DNA sequence: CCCGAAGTCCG
DNA sequence: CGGACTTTCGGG
């Protein structure tokens, strides 16, 4: 079975505009885990737009197929485009897509893709269906996969006043001993972000519970101005 | 325009 | 460790 024509068209059009000179530092920035074509986001968005204008966006029956085929292509711009395309199908994504999103998290994994999946697509799903959190989060924390662990930390990132504080702190407590940078930093990030909504609770948490030094410092990057740094 | 959100380099 | 500085991206 041939590649979906929309994906083939995108591949052809991206490749025709590749920039090997830019590709080298772009790939180095992601620690050479991926090949790059060398197309940065403004042009990459326009090239996608070009193909939608010519071909139209595929029927929703093909949504998951298109995403997978792009995920399987070697150059990282195709996963970035896949995520742009998933946003175009946003109104069709629901709680039944959690396993599909899980599989995207644990394939071609790195912070650029995982952070584009978790606080937005998964965050929205669990905001609407909080009763499903306990069907996934314990497994993610227990897994060997640091990107599922990061997903458990960051899916609430944008919740603001809808944050489940008890859940957030329980998740952080489970992962606070991790020596993995991407886990320590995610803990720092979600605490720093939630402190914009409720600084008192984050300050109390970091003063009274164990965290990696990186996590604590990132958490209080801003609110240390509000409380002061004791001698 | 601005500000806030990985990478290298240094002490 | 933790700060200074880097380029890119999202968004006010
Ligand atoms: C991706 N990226 C680029 N530049 C910065 N200053 C950043 N801080 C966090 N993440 C960043």
């Amino acid at each position: 079975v041939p590649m979906h024509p929309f994906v083939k068209a995108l591949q052809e059009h991206f490749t025709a505009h590749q920039n090997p000179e830019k590709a080298e530092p772009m790939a180095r920035y992601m620690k050479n885990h991926f090949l790059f074509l060398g197309i940065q986001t403004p042009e990459r968005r326009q090239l996608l737009k070009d193909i939608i204008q010519i071909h139209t966006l595929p029927d929703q029956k093909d949504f998951q197929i298109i995403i997978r085929e792009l995920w399987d292509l070697p150059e990282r711009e195709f996963q970035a485009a896949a995520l742009d395309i998933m946003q175009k199908y946003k109104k069709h994504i629901n709680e039944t897509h959690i396993p599909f999103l899980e599989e995207l998290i644990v394939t071609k994994s790195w912070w650029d893709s995982v952070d584009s999946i978790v606080p937005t697509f998964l965050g929205d799903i669990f905001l609407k269906h909080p009763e499903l959190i306990s069907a996934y989060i314990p497994k993610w924390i227990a897994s060997d996969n640091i990107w599922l662990q990061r997903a458990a930390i960051l899916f609430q990132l944008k919740y603001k006043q809808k944050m489940d504080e008890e859940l957030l702190f329980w998740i952080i407590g489970q992962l606070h001993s991790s020596k993995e940078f991407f886990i320590q930093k995610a803990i720092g990030w979600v605490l720093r972000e939630y402190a914009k909504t409720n600084p008192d609770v984050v300050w109390e948490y970091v003063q009274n519970n164990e965290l990696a030094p990186l996590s604590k410092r990132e958490a209080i990057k801003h609110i240390k101005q509000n409380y002061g740094i004791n001698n």
Side-chain angles (χ1 to χ4, degrees):
Chain A
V1 180
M3 181 185 292
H4 190 287
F6 186 85
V7 176
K8 183 175 183 177
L10 200 70
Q11 185 185 38
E12 290 180 20
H13 194 41
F14 282 19
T15 301
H17 291 269
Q18 70 182 128
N19 185 327
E21 293 93 331
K22 286 189 188 148
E24 180 169 345
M26 289 173 73
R28 284 196 343 259
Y29 183 64
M30 300 308 182
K31 296 286 184 67
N32 288 289
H33 293 302
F34 314 103
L35 299 180
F36 275 78
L37 291 177
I39 309 170
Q40 295 176 308
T41 295
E43 183 175 12
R44 197 200 66 240
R45 295 243 162 93
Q46 182 60 51
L47 296 175
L48 173 59
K49 188 166 178 176
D50 292 339
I51 294 313
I52 295 173
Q53 286 170 358
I54 293 165
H55 297 275
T56 74
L57 190 74
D59 186 274
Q60 52 80 27
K61 74 185 183 59
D62 295 336
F63 150 51
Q64 298 96 316
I65 292 162
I66 296 308
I67 298 314
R68 172 269 292 182
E69 289 186 0
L70 288 165
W71 223 251
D72 283 348
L73 290 179
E75 294 88 2
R76 191 53 160 176
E77 289 92 344
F78 293 114
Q79 287 94 67
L83 294 165
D84 287 339
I85 290 166
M86 195 156 68
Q87 185 61 39
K88 293 177 180 303
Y89 292 103
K90 177 68 171 186
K91 296 189 177 190
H92 303 278
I93 298 171
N94 54 65
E95 74 285 350
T96 72
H97 292 95
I98 295 170
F100 170 76
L101 296 170
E102 280 186 316
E103 186 65 14
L104 292 175
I105 289 169
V106 301
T107 56
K108 306 294 194 75
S109 308
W110 201 237
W111 60 263
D112 57 326
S113 56
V114 172
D115 296 352
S116 294
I117 296 161
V118 170
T120 46
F121 295 98
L122 280 168
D124 286 348
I125 288 166
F126 288 131
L127 203 51
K128 187 174 179 182
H129 309 275
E131 78 279 358
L132 296 180
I133 292 171
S134 62
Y136 293 97
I137 268 55
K139 174 187 69 184
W140 293 355
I141 291 170
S143 80
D144 297 322
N145 191 295
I146 61 166
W147 303 104
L148 291 176
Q149 295 163 22
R150 183 157 167 125
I153 295 161
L154 293 179
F155 81 93
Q156 295 191 102
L157 181 66
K158 309 168 65 174
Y159 280 15
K160 297 185 180 181
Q161 294 211 342
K162 294 184 170 305
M163 179 69 77
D164 184 339
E165 297 188 349
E166 172 178 327
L167 174 67
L168 175 70
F169 292 130
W170 181 84
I171 291 171
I172 291 170
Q174 296 294 132
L175 291 167
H176 84 272
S177 292
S178 174
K179 295 179 175 66
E180 170 56 51
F181 167 85
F182 285 116
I183 298 308
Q184 298 183 2
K185 183 64 172 294
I187 290 169
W189 187 8
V190 75
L191 289 172
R192 197 198 313 113
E193 189 68 17
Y194 187 52
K196 298 175 183 182
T197 296
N198 193 339
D200 281 344
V201 77
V202 173
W203 182 257
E204 192 280 340
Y205 183 79
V206 305
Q207 294 301 299
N208 291 281
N209 300 265
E210 294 188 358
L211 293 171
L214 168 64
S215 302
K216 182 174 185 182
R217 170 174 33 89
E218 291 291 340
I220 65 170
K221 187 171 184 178
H222 303 306
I223 62 172
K224 67 185 173 71
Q225 274 61 249
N226 302 95
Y227 299 104
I229 303 159
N230 298 333
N231 297 277

